[PDB]
Amino acid sequence: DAPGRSQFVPADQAFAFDFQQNQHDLNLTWQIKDGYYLYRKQIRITPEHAKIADVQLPQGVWHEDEFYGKSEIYRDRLTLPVTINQASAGATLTVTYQGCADAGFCYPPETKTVPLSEVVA
């Protein structure tokens, strides 16, 4: 197998997404496999039946690829705190993101639906 031929693993293996909620405090986490990266600009977070504080994405590193030229990317891990000011019962957070492999391909954008536990304002 010529170099980087086994790099097309399932997207959830390249970018292992998980979340943890404690009342108003939500943590979103991506474990990012070595040799893979997330585009900062492709992250979208959208509440449904919940009110959240503005989300500030953290500072990543710059990288060059043939897809977009120069853009800001994340490697290793992405930790993103979200503050839930209110959430109705059955509220959700839609989290969309896109990552690529250094071996020379990009995955399609991915969407995860986070079930939010109710939070009274």
Curated annotation (Swiss-Prot):
Disulfide bonds join C100-C106. Changing C106A: Loss of activity. It is found in: Cell inner membrane. Residues 1-121 are periplasmic. The consequences of replacement of the cysteines with alanines were found to depend on the conditions tested and on the reporter system used for the analysis, and then differ depending on the references. Belongs to the thioredoxin family. DsbD subfamily. Required to facilitate the formation of correct disulfide bonds in some periplasmic proteins and for the assembly of the periplasmic c-type cytochromes. Acts by transferring electrons from cytoplasmic thioredoxin to the periplasm, thereby maintaining the active site of DsbC, DsbE and DsbG in a reduced state. This transfer involves a cascade of disulfide bond formation and reduction steps. This is Thiol:disulfide interchange protein DsbD. It comes from Escherichia coli (strain K12). The lineage of its organism: Bacteria, Pseudomonadati, Pseudomonadota, Gammaproteobacteria, Enterobacterales. The chain holds residues 23 to 143 of 565 of the full protein.
